[PDB]
Write a protein that binds this ligand. Structure first.
Ligand SMILES: Cc1cc2nc3c(=O)[nH]c(=O)nc-3n(C[C@H](O)[C@H](O)[C@H](O)COP(=O)(O)OP(=O)(O)OC[C@H]3O[C@@H](n4cnc5c(N)ncnc54)[C@H](O)[C@@H]3O)c2cc1C
Ligand SMILES: Cc1ncc(C(=O)O)cc1O
Length: 369
């Protein structure tokens, strides 16, 4: 009976744990936090990620209570510039905790051993995981899913391309306030861009009949637009049609202005150690594939470990097989971000939807564009 130690309780670690447990592995997941939770307010999942949920036996709990907008619409200075539906390509919007809970309940129903207040501080390719307390654990597989700043990764030393975004955003969950919004298509995802009179953007994303996921984006150099709690006035001014929701968002005293970083490594494996999720490939959010690829990769890792080969060879086989999809997605998303391509609309092209089109279960590309 094989034993795996997963460091990190995020979407990647939870995905890895569940997939491994389903294949007969004895698995223990380590979460440094005192409780299992997810941050970031809301999240978009596509066909590729939805398929992972199916393979994990956690799709039903996710679909129930999540939302698929009639269309993905883009605005530039309040003028609708595009409405995209991706030719039937499945996608979904939900609060992060809704997705996190589905994964945690499944992990528990499976008998995955989850340890809170357990922080991994080092990993040995020979198959050993060291915790912050000094306690050393041995296993046949060590999974580094501890996000950006991954101690598992840095304890081993990987060649890393790092970049940090100077600009960030404020992500919040507020009431739909649908009736107060009056006439409109308020069930759609609406990416509201603006460069004049100021650079302010709001990604409007309904999660269900009760919750709305908002992303208020302004330059870090904007003292008003980047402030938290939100400077109500500055947002209502350029997004008056959302005052009802903005008024509610202004009451959230814990809102935060988050920046992000991207990560590209020369490799994702070392001996019996495999890096997954942000720890291995954090990317720009343009294509909304950060978690999608993380879940695909974590799930794919379990598949390669079912070939009858050594864990070491399975890991290199895993990277070689699945990595290209993430590299291209990460590269394209970076290009979109730098050129602000999404502001033009109709940018979810076949190339952009490549990762989303991938079906990890059958290991083929579906929903052609
Ligand atoms: C602004 C923004 C918007 C985004 N929108 C989307 C989207 O719409 N759709 C999408 O798919 N992706 C999106 N992403 C990307 C997505 O958030 C990430 O790819 C994903 O959540 C991270 O996966 P993870 O589980 O590896 O990381 P984490 O999310 O942080 O995994 C690590 C977890 O392990 C714990 N941990 C950390 N260190 C240790 C340690 N040393 N020992 C034990 N535990 C530890 C932490 O508590 C943490 O929760 C977005 C990213 C940004 C920045
Ligand atoms: C879902 C999503 N899409 C695009 C961005 C971006 O910052 O360009 C952020 C998102 O959460």
């Amino acid at each position: 009976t094989r034993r795996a130690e997963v460091a990190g309780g995020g979407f990647a670690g939870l995905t890895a744990a569940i997939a491994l447990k389903q294949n007969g592995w004895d698995v223990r997941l380590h979460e440094k936090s005192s409780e299992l939770r997810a941050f970031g307010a809301g999240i978009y999942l596509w066909h590729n990620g939805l398929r992972v949920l199916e393979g994990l036996g956690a799709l039903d709990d996710v679909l129930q209570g999540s939302h698929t907008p009639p269309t993905y619409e883009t605005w530039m200075h309040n003028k609708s510039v595009s409405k995209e539906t991706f030719n039937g390509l499945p996608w979904r919007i939900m609060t992060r905790s809704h997705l996190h809970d589905a994964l945690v309940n499944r992990a528990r129903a499976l008998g995955v051993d989850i340890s809170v207040n357990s922080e991994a501080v080092a990993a040995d390719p020979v198959g050993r995981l060291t915790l912050q307390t000094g306690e050393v654990l041995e296993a046949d597989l060590i999974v580094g899913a501890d996000g950006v700043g991954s101690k598992v990764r840095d304890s081993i030393g990987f060649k890393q391309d790092r970049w940090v975004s100077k600009d960030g955003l404020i992500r919040l969950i507020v009431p739909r306030m649908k009736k107060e919004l009056g006439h409109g298509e308020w069930d759609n995802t609406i990416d509201m861009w603006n460069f004049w009179p100021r650079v302010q953007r709001i990604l409007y994303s309904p999660c269900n009949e009760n919750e709305l996921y908002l992303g208020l984006m302004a330059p870090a150099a904007d003292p008003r637009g980047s402030s938290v709690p939100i400077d109500l006035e500055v947002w209502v001014e350029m997004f008056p049609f959302l005052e009802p929701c903005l008024i509610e968002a202004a009451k959230l005293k814990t809102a935060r202005y988050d920046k992000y970083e991207t990560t590209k490594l020369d490799s994702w494996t070392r001996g019996k150690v495999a890096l997954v999720g942000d720890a291995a490939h954090a990317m720009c959010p343009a294509l909304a594939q950060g978690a999608g690829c993380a879940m695909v990769n974590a799930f794919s890792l379990s598949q390669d470990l079912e070939e009858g080969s050594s864990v070491e060879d399975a890991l290199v086989a895993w990277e070689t097989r699945i990595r290209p999809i993430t590299d291209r997605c990460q590269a394209l998303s970076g290009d979109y971000a730098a050129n602000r391509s999404l502001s033009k609309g109709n940018m979810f092209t076949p190339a952009a939807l490549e990762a989303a089109r991938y079906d990890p279960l059958r290991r083929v590309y579906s929903w052609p564009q």
